[PDB]
Design a protein around this ligand. Structure first.
Ligand SMILES: O=c1cc(N2CCOCC2)oc2c(-c3ccccc3)cccc12
Length: 127
């Protein structure tokens, strides 16, 4: 069994921009989610080999996790906040697609998403 390569986190051809919104996404949003008691499964890509989930990457074709998001924020991969917000949403929706309502991992994702949306409500206006 094999895992796919992780999502891209470095590309010198992709234009980059540091914005106050992206800085908030790293300093407030990512940091707040990372320390939550339910963050740990989401801090790195799903290792479907070690978890014995051989169909995972047959169902989830846009993998995303907060370890990748952290790297993208810390390595200035993004042009805008919407790209980063989309990554968080991809992570949550993957979990809801692959698993059943009320499953433990779904409850964990939902707790993180509730917190994420609360933080997004305070996203600062662009400079
Ligand atoms: O969608 C997912 C399904 C699961 N699975 C299926 C249910 O049993 C446990 C493994 O695991 C996930 C994990 C994870 C769970 C436990 C340990 C490490 C990572 C992290 C992110 C998403 C998923």
């Amino acid at each position: 069994s094999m895992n796919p390569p992780p999502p891209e986190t470095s590309n010198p051809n992709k234009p980059k921009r540091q914005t106050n919104q992206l800085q908030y996404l790293l300093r407030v949003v990512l940091k707040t989610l990372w320390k939550h008691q339910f963050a740990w499964p989401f801090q790195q890509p799903v290792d479907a080999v070690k978890l014995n989930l051989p169909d995972y990457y047959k169902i989830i074709k846009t993998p995303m996790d907060m370890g990748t998001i952290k790297k993208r924020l810390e390595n200035n991969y993004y042009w805008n906040a919407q790209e980063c917000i989309q990554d968080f949403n991809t992570m949550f929706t993957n979990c809801y697609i692959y698993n059943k309502p009320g499953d433990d991992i779904v409850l964990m994702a939902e707790a993180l998403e509730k917190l994420f949306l609360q933080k997004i409500n305070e996203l600062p206006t662009e400079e």
